[PDB]
């Protein structure tokens, strides 16, 4: 079950391994389009959070689920901000979301007075007046129940067939690693010139024991120059100083 | 629902005389009215729209005015061919109509 | 669900915030540096509202206050009287609201469609055991819940001056309810100490709700020597709290060896503070320093457009046959 | 343009009356079709309307139960069924086009292209 | 949705048997149609399939020569001709829809919407 | 081509008893199987797809398992209405089928 676009599942993904299974290479999706990230680098990157916005749309409106777009869904049902980090993933659902007489459990906002804000749900049943007559609770002549059903039926056109779309909204990791790709651990090498990754702060240097006393919440640390001075080892919590290689 | 009363029930005029046709609504219809002309046994033809504007194909002698609940049609000179039953159409209903007859 | 009475009606007092309200703005360790940062901080020497919950004429207060851009909360007590907060936009079950309560045995953080009492409270009965929890009548459709590990709370009706100062900062950024705090020993009878300490982060809650108002939660004391009427049969163990508001400010923060913030300059407080921020120093030598610029602002708006009474024929171009 | 109506009929009370209004061109989506009752010698009563573009129908309260309205997407045709036929309910009835419409729901006011109607009796 | 099949027939051996499965909607391009033989009282045998979207047909080896399959783009209809009719080859046969398909050639597995079939004998 | 053998040829069970239906392929079909239920004189209806998944509209009592060449259907409780001939469909062929009969 996916929501019609009126509401959507917004389950938050955290404290886990975001193995993205190179889904973009699975060919199970018609659309797999990333904006603030390269789709091939998703397994290297860490996020504080990933949110998966999950809903059903018509094929001709797949193109509207993108930042900065306009259209009936983009403006009244599901809006993405111009500034967006995440990936839009979509695929055909004829054998789940379509019924012979039409699946009418999927509805979208058709009649709205103003645009929807980025990422807010509408979930409204307010009767909309398209004319000058108050039509107060009349729901006819010139006013409408705002939510319209879709003719999701098995032999309709490809642009009318339902598609499942999931938008993965990303919060870049400003936090201790929370959501990351399928990284492998290594041993710890002190001294010598080492190319290191941790939870980010990728760089090269010589890792040595630190005499710094970090407060229990700090994790990381910097110099006057805004450079990394020291890093708390994500495992066992030893503080290591980072010295540039000669 | 919205209900309309028309007046006179019957309008008796000589050809060439001025006709005034009144329509009164129970509640406001804003400007959502249309006027139609009925020949006996027929469904009436469009004369006026949005409670005042002359419909395309209609002679300049026919025009209206009014708002909310109080509406009217002025026929500057009523010709023998114009002695029709005149009706006001409300959004979802119709008024009783005025039968216009030659005196 | 009880509306309390026998309280008196007195105006709020106001106090000097002095140099309190600073917190670590980040997680990064810094050491032996002066760092300039912009964030929402309690301004130095601000006007803080002082609330009372002392039997004495009886005070309990506990009003609903604006949250605005985030708040500074501080309290002085000796017996676990000030226990929690309610945050949200309505607090009437129509929307999601946040309830944080330090109950004697478990700290509970919940976000639900709560129907709050219009005079919510907690309480302890003395023969010192908890007897009441009357905060809400409903908590449906819950989206967030956390409960801390069971612990023992000291409910004893201790005497003397206030012994425990607890300071908190409550902010709401991008859906995160950020809580900072510090616990220091005190010997106080009326106001906040004129000292300095930065608050440390405690929790960062991924909640996603709109907070415009909040209310605190105080415990009531009842006993075998008190009338049993639920509205009038109660007293207020002495406690007091102070509420300030955060404002955008630039501060120069001083990190000592081992990375503790030991001092700060509020760059908007006065001209010397401006000089100190400009120079990145807590010491200024003798001389003249430039500290920004001065400009006269307009106090009026004048048009003097020509007396053209002609309207443009857009209604002839448009609406044409 | 035109609404092509069904002819007249006479039926036993209780037997449903079903007629239709066929039209060429893109009228299913371009116009709203309304059904109006005209007892012979009488004025007009609204029965109901179908907005085929939105798959929605509105009815006059006095005609609820009595009137069912639908439409066919292939060669735009409006259909109406009059249930519970009574000899008292003898009338000429017709379809009419709500000329002011849009795919943006601009909203309707008046009608044109009336089909005049078909007499149905007992 | 539906596959509308031809009725039963009896013919002289050697006379070709031609039947069809008519369906409404965009089924020519959306689904693959397969023909299956069911002698009465028996289980099923695959005869062949037409992928109308790609203009291609595959046949069971035991049915090559014997079975010819085509399709009509105008009002999606599958057709099949059984050559060299023998009285031994008496069977009920039908069309079935390969439900999992795409214009990207996602590939088929199972079937649904079986037409049950038509008996052809001598 | 791909050929399948089914077992038992006939399954005799009392109503309410557990049924196990076996399918064995001559070569691998990966997961490309479907199960169908035949009423006498009828072409069988879809029960299972991709050799294990329950088809929409099918009760939870019917599910399968298996891979490559070895496949099976479990009917947790076989009801009187379920005593059908069960068939496994291979990519381009069908197995012999198991006739399920009431004991
Ligand atoms: C408290 O007073 C308000 C009116 O200000 C009333 O609506 C509410 O029901 C009262 N609650 C209790 C517990 O007495
Ligand atoms: C503001 O502070 C002054 C002391 O400088 C005090 O006298 C006054 O009452 C305070 N007013 C408010 C509203 O806090
Ligand atoms: C830093 O930590 C050492 C630990 O031995 C302590 O002696 C020193 O006083 C601390 N410095 C400051 C400024 O707190
Ligand atoms: C032109 O039409 C608009 C409606 O679109 C109306 O508001 C305006 O008053 C009209 N202007 C004239 C000159 O009739």
The CATH number of residue C79's host domain is 2.60.120.960
How far, in Å, CA of C2 to CA of C131, rounded?
14
Q: Which residue minimizes the CA distance to atom 11 of ligand 1?
A: C3
CB contact residues (below 8 A), chain A span 75-104, against chain E: 92, 94-95, 100
**Residue C131 placed within a domain:** yes
For residue E45, count CB atoms less than 10 angstroms from its CB and return exposed for 0-12, middle for 13-18, buried for 19 or more.
Answer: middle
Neighbours of C292 (CB within 10 A): 10
Distance of residue E98 Cα from the nearest chain F Cα, in angstroms: 11
Atom number of ligand 3 nearest to Cα C256:
13
Alpha carbons C7 and C5: distance in angstroms, whole number: 5
- Residue B83 · residue B101 · CB < 8 Å: yes
User: Atom 3 (ligand 3): residue with closest C-alpha?
Assistant: C258
Instruction: Give the whole-angstrom CA distance, residue F89 versus residue E49.
Output: 15
> Residue A107 forms beta bridges with which residues?
A149
Does the beta-carbon distance from C28 to A14 stay under 8 Å?
no
Probe site for chain B from D8, D44, D58 (most B CB atoms < 10 A): D44
Q: Which ligand has its closest atom nearest to the C-alpha of C119?
A: 1
Residues of F numbered 38-67 whose beta carbons fall under 8 angstroms of chain E's beta carbons: which are they? 38, 40-46, 49-50, 55
Interface probe for C, chosen from A213, A226, A240, A241 (most Cβ of C below 10 Å), is A213
Q: B17: which DSSP letter?
A: -
Q: Are strands F19-25 and F70-75 parallel, antiparallel or unpaired?
A: antiparallel
DSSP of chain A: --EEBTB-EEEEE-SEE---TTGGGSS--SEEEESSS-TTSTTT-EEEEEEEEEEEEEGGGGGGSSTT--SHHHHHT----SS--EEEEEEE-TTTS--TT-BTT-EEE---SSPPPTT------PPEE-SSS--TTT-STTEE-SEEE--B-TTS-TTTSEEEEEEEEEEE--SSS-EE-S--------SS-EEE-TTS--EEEEEEE------TT--EEE-TTS-EEEEE-TTTT-EEEEE---
Residue in B28, B31, B91 nearest the CB of A141 = B91
User: What backbone torsions phi and psi does residue C274 show, to the nearest 5 degrees?
Assistant: -65, -40
Is E46 in contact with F42 (Cβ distance < 8 A)?
A: no
Contact present, F85 and F99 (Cβ < 8 Å):
yes
Residue F72 vs residues D22, F52, F67: alpha-carbon distances, Å = 56, 8, 9
Ligand 4 centroid vs D108 CA: distance in angstroms? 17
Beta-carbon contacts of residue C319 (< 8 Å; ≥ 6 apart): none
* DSSP character string of C297-308: PP----------
Best residue among C312, C314, C318, C319 to mutate for probing ligand 4's pocket (most ligand atoms within 8 Å of CB) is C319
C-alpha dihedral sign at B65, B71, B77, B78: positive
Q: Tell me the CA distances in angstroms from A181 to A169, A218, C158, one per residue in order.
A: 16, 23, 54
Q: How far apart are CA A111 and CA D51, in angstroms?
A: 15
Count of residues making up chain A = 246
Report how far residue C13's alpha carbon sits from residue C167's, in angstroms, rounded to the nearest whole number.
Answer: 19
Domains detected in chain F: 4-102 (2.60.40.10)
D49 vs chain A: nearest CA distance in angstroms? 9
Cβ D39 vs Cβ B87: under 8 Å? no
Does any ligand 2 atom lie closer than 6 A to the CB of residue C151? no
Q: How far apart are CA A44 and CA A198, in angstroms?
A: 11
d(CA C107, CA C145): 11
Output the CA C131–ligand 1 centroid distance in Å: 21
C-alpha–C-alpha distance, residues F34 and E105, integer Å: 20
> Do the Cβ atoms of E109 and F49 come within 8 Å?
yes
- Give the separation between CA B92 and CA D86, rounded to whole angstroms: 24
Residues of chain A contacting residue B2, judged by C-beta atoms under 8 Å apart = none
Q: What DSSP string runs through C246-299?
A: -EEEEEEEEE-GGG-EEEEEETTS-HHHHHHHHTT-S---SS--------PPP-
Structural domain boundaries, residue C237 = 13-279
Residue A50: CA count within 13 A, CB half-sphere? 25
Distance CA B89, CA B44 (A): 11
How many structural domains does chain D have?
A: 1
Quick check: D28 and D75 in contact, CB under 8 A? no
Domain span at residue E61? 4-120
Contact F86, F27 (CB under 8 A): no
3-class secondary structure, E10:
strand
Nearest alpha-carbon partner for C80 in C160, C12, C1, C166: C166
In terms of DSSP bridges, do strands F34-38 and F85-90 run parallel, antiparallel, or are they unpaired? antiparallel
State the method: cryo-EM
Other C-beta atoms within 10 Å of F50: how many?
14
> In Å, how far from its chain's centre is CA C173?
14
The ligand with the least distance to the CA atom of C242 is 2
- Helix/strand/coil for C179: strand
Partners of residue A1 on adjacent β-strands: none
Are C293 and C278 in contact by the 8 Å Cβ rule? The answer is no
Separation CA A110–CA B17 (nearest Å): 51
Q: Which phi-psi region, left, alpha or beta, contains residue C80 (left: φ > 0; alpha: ψ -120 to 50)?
A: left
Beta strands at A16-17 and A86-92: parallel, antiparallel or unpaired: unpaired
Q: Which of A167, A158, A161, A151 is CA-nearest to residue A31? A: A167
Task: Tell me whether residues D106 and A148 touch, CB distance under 8 A.
Answer: no
Q: Is residue C51 part of a domain?
A: yes
Alpha-carbon gap, residue D16 to A42, rounded angstroms = 64
Strands C107-126 and C213-223, bridge-based pairing: parallel
Specified resolution (Å): 3.4
What's the length of chain D?
122
Strands, E assignment, F1-103: 4-7, 10-13, 19-25, 34-38, 45-49, 53-54, 62-67, 70-75, 85-90, 93-94, 98-102
Q: Do A141 and B29 touch (CB under 8 A)?
A: no
A 10 A CB-CB count for A211 gives 8
Written as six digits, the tokens of C17 are 């915030």
Could you write out the three-class secondary structure of E46-106? EEEEEECCCCEEEECHHHCCCEEEEEECCCCEEEEEECCCCCCCCEEEEEEEECCCCCCCC
CATH number reported for the structural domain that contains residue D87 in this entry: 2.60.40.10
Single out the residue of E76, E69, E82 nearest to residue E24, CA to CA.
Answer: E76
Strand partners, E71: E78
Q: Inter-chain contact A222–C200, Cβ cutoff 8 Å?
A: no
Picking from A219, A210, A215, the residue whose alpha carbon sits closest to that of residue A239 is A210
Which residues, other chains included, contact E61 with Cβ-Cβ below 8 Å and sequence gap of 6+? F1
- What lies within 8 Å, CB to CB, of D102 at 6+ separation is none
> Which CA distances in Å does E63 have to A241, E35, E40?
77, 11, 18
Question: Distance (Å) from the C-alpha of residue A24 to the closest C-alpha of chain C?
Answer: 29
User: Do A160 and A151 meet the contact criterion of CB atoms below 8 Å apart?
Assistant: yes
The closest alpha carbon to E64, from C319, A6, F1, F81, belongs to F1
Distance CA C89, CA B15 (A): 72
Q: How far apart are CA B63 and CA B73, in angstroms?
A: 6
Whether the CB of A118 is below 8 Å from some CB of chain C: the reply is: no
Contact A133 B91 (CB under 8 A): yes
Within a 10 A sphere around the Cβ of B57, how many other Cβ atoms?
A: 8
Using most ligand atoms within 8 A of CB, pick from C29, C33, C196, C258 the residue to mutate for ligand 3: C258
Is some CB atom of chain F closer than 8 A to the CB atom of E39? no
Task: Please tell me the distance in Å from F18's CA to the nearest CA on chain E.
Answer: 24
Q: Is C8 in the pocket of ligand 1 (CB under 6 A)?
A: no
Closest to D105 (Cβ–Cβ): which among A130, A141, A149? A130
Residue C299 lies in a domain: no
Q: Are E118 and E93 in contact (CB under 8 A)?
A: yes
> What is the number of the ligand 2 atom nearest to the C-alpha of C47?
14
**Does C302 map to a domain?**
no
List C-alpha distances in Å: B92 to B24, C74, D109, E76.
15, 65, 10, 43
CA neighbours closer than 13 Å in the CB half-sphere of residue B98: 24
Whether residue B13 contacts residue B70, with contact meaning beta carbons closer than 8 Å, is answered with no
Q: Which of E41, E109, E116 sits opposite F43 (nearest CB)?
A: E116
Q: A213 alpha carbon to ligand 3 midpoint, in Å?
A: 9
The sheet that has E4-5: what strands, in order across it?
Answer: E4-5, E17-22, E77-82, E67-72
Which residues on chain C are in Cβ contact (under 8 Å) with A224? 33
In 3-state terms, what secondary structure has residue F82?
Answer: helix
Candidates C237, C222, C246; CA nearest to C74 is C246
Is D109 at the interface with chain B, CB within 8 A?
Answer: yes
| Side-chain-side CA neighbours of residue A11 (13 Å) | 7
Residue A110: alpha-carbon gap to chain centroid? 25
Helix-strand-coil split of chain C, %, nearest 5: 5, 45, 50
Name which of C33, C206, C259 is nearest A215 (Cβ-Cβ): C259
Check if C31 has its Cβ closer than 6 Å to any atom of ligand 3: no
What's phi and psi for C21, nearest 5 deg? 110, 5
Residue labelled with tokens 């539906």: E2
Nearest CB to C29 within list A14, A49, A221: A221
Place of tokens 């908007």: C268
């Amino acid at each position: 079950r996916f929501a019609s676009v009126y509401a959507w599942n917004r389950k938050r993904i955290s404290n886990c391994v975001a193995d993205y299974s190179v889904l973009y290479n699975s060919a199970s999706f018609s659309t797999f389009k990333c904006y603030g990230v390269c789709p091939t680098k998703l397994n290297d990157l860490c996020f504080t959070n990933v949110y998966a916005d999950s809903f059903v749309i018509r094929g001709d409106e797949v193109r509207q689920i993108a930042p900065g777009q306009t259209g009936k869904i983009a403006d009244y049902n599901y809006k993405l901000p111009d500034d967006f980090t995440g990936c839009v993933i979509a695929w055909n659902s004829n054998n789940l979301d379509s019924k012979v007489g039409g699946n009418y459990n999927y509805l979208y906002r058709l009649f709205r007075k103003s645009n929807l804000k980025p990422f807010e749900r509408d979930i409204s049943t307010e009767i909309y007046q398209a004319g000058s007559t108050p039509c107060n609770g009349v729901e006819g002549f010139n006013c409408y129940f705002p939510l319209q059903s879709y003719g999701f039926q098995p032999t309709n056109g490809v642009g009318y067939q339902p598609y499942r779309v999931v938008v993965l909204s990303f919060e870049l990791l400003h936090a201790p690693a929370t959501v990351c790709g399928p990284k492998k651990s290594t041993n710890l090498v002190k001294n010598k010139c080492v190319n290191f990754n941790f939870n980010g702060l990728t760089g090269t240097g010589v890792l040595t024991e630190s005499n710094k006393k970090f407060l229990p919440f700090q994790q990381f640390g910097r110099d006057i120059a805004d450079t990394t001075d020291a890093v708390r080892d994500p495992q066992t919590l030893e503080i290591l100083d980072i010295t540039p290689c000669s | 629902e919205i209900v309309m009363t028309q007046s006179p029930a019957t309008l008796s005029l000589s050809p060439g005389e001025r006709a005034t046709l009144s329509c009164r609504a129970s509640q406001s219809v804003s400007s959502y009215l249309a006027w139609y002309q009925q020949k006996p046994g027929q469904a009436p033809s469009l004369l006026i729209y949005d409670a005042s504007n002359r419909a395309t194909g209609i002679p300049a002698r026919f025009s209206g005015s009014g708002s909310g609940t109080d509406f009217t049609l002025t026929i500057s000179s009523l010709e023998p061919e114009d002695f029709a039953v005149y009706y006001c159409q409300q959004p979802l209903t119709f008024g009783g109509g005025t039968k216009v007859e030659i005196k | 669900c009880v509306n309390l009475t026998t309280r008196t009606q007195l105006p709020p007092a106001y106090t000097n915030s002095f140099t309190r309200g600073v917190y670590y703005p980040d997680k990064v360790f810094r050491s032996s540096v002066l760092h300039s940062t912009q964030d929402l901080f309690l301004p130095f020497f601000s006007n803080v509202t002082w609330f009372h919950a002392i039997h004495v004429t009886k005070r309990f207060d506990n009003p609903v206050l604006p949250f605005n851009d985030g708040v500074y909360f501080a309290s002085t007590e000796k017996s676990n009287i000030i226990r929690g907060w309610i945050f949200g936009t309505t607090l009437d079950s129509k929307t999601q609201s946040l309830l944080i309560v330090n109950n004697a045995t478990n700290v509970v953080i919940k976000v639900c469609e709560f129907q709050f009492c219009n005079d919510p409270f907690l309480g302890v009965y003395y023969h010192w055991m908890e007897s009441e929890f009357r905060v809400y009548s409903s908590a449906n459709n819950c989206t967030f819940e956390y409960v801390s590990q069971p612990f023992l709370m000291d409910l004893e009706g201790k005497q003397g001056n206030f012994k425990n100062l607890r300071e908190f900062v409550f902010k709401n950024i991008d859906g995160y309810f950020k809580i900072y705090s510090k616990h220091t020993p005190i010997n106080l009878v009326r106001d906040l100490p004129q000292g300095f300490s930065a608050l440390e982060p405690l929790v960062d809650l991924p909640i996603g709700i709109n907070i415009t108002r909040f209310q605190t939660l105080l415990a009531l004391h009842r006993s075998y020597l008190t009338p049993g009427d639920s509205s009038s049969g109660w007293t207020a163990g002495a406690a007091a709290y102070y509420v300030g508001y955060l404002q955008p400010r630039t501060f120069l923060l001083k990190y000592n060896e081992n990375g503790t913030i030991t001092d700060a300059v509020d760059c908007a407080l006065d001209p010397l503070s401006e000089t100190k921020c400009t120079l990145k120093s807590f010491t200024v030598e003798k001389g003249i320093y430039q500290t920004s610029n001065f400009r006269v602002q307009p106090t009026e708006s004048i048009v003097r457009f020509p007396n053209i009474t002609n309207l443009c024929p857009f209604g002839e171009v448009f609406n044409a046959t | 343009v035109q609404l092509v109506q069904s002819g007249a009929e006479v039926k036993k009370p209780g037997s449903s009356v079903k007629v239709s209004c066929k039209a060429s061109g893109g009228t299913f989506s371009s116009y709203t079709i309304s059904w109006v009752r005209q007892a012979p010698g009488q004025g007009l009563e609204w029965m109901g309307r179908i907005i085929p573009i939105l798959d929605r129908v509105m009815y006059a309260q006095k005609f609820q139960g009595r009137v069912t309205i639908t439409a066919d997407k292939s060669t735009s045709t409006a259909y109406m069924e009059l249930s519970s036929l009574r000899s008292e309910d003898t009338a000429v009835y017709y379809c009419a086009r709500r000329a002011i419409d849009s795919d943006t729901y601009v909203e309707q006011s008046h009608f044109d292209y009336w089909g005049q109607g078909t007499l149905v009796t007992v």
